[PDB]
Every structure is written in structure tokens, then in C-alpha cells.
Point group: D2
Chain length 49, copies 4
């Protein structure tokens, strides 16, 4: 049982850490797109008068 | 000139606030997708033995 | 054993969901502080000439 | 006037980009703290039986 509980707990941790990395990267990528969005909009507004 | 500077500054602020809202919503939506991702993966792992 | 594995898996899920909520709230709160930061800085810059 | 508008627009852009960097870093740092939080909690739960 302790064998199981030790294993299932460590599986939980590994799962959570994997998801943390995937999520941290997905964030970075969103921030990248948002910065491109801000640039286009600022330029589009500057061009209008 | 002061008329301009007052106007262009306020335009900056409004732009930044708009982008803040759009970005805050895009975040929420990402967090939603990530939670669905975690659920599917956890279920897929639980089903394997 | 299946009793254990079912229980430990569900504990994993509940832990992950709890952390998801706590983290989503911590984000919201950061975004709040960042918006206050942008306001102060914009005002401080506008005041300088 | 065009001199002003060109300058104030570029100031807007630089401000927004600076805040983007500061904010992206503040995020990274939060994600770091959250990962430490998850580790402590998981360990604290594993220790209880």
C-alpha cells in the first residue's frame, strides 16, 4: 500500500510540474501575441487623423 | 500644444486600459483551456494501468 | 488497492483544482496591481515637462 | 504639431513596451512562487495520514 501511495503521490507531483511548464510556456506565447496586438493597434491608430 | 499633449496623453491611457481588459480576458480564457487540458490528461492517465 | 488508487487519484485532481483557483485569483490580483502601477507611472510622466 | 504627435505617440509605445517587460517578469516571478506553494502543500499533504 505504501508502495502504491508513494508512487501515486510522486505521479501527482510529476503531472503537476509538467502542466506547470506547459502552462508557463502557453502564457509566454500569449504575452508575445498580446505585444504584437498592441503594436498593430498603436500603429493603426497613429495612421488615422 | 497643451491641448494636443493633454489629448494625446489621455489617448495613451485609454489605449492602455482597453488593452489591459482585452488581455485580462484572454488570460481568463487561457486558464479555462488549461484547466480542461489538466482534466483530460488526468483522466487519460487514470484510465491507463 | 483499487480503493487506494481511486482515492489518491481523486485527491490529485482536487489538489490541482484548488491550486488552479488560488493561482487564478493571485493572477487577477497581480493584474490589479499592474494596472495601478501603469496609472501612477503615466500620471508621473504627464506631470513632467 | 506633427513633431509633438510623433513624439507623444512614440512615448506611448515606449511606455507600453516597458510596462510589458516589467509585467512579463512579475508574472514569471508569481509562477515561481506558485510552484513553490504547490510543492510545500503536496509535501505537507503527503506527510499526513
Amino acid at each position: 500500500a505504501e508502495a502504491q501511495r508513494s508512487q501515486l503521490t510522486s505521479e501527482c507531483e510529476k503531472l503537476m510540474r509538467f502542466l506547470d511548464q506547459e502552462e508557463r510556456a502557453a502564457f509566454s506565447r500569449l504575452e508575445d501575441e498580446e505585444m504584437r496586438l498592441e503594436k498593430r493597434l498603436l500603429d493603426n491608430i497613429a495612421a488615422l487623423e
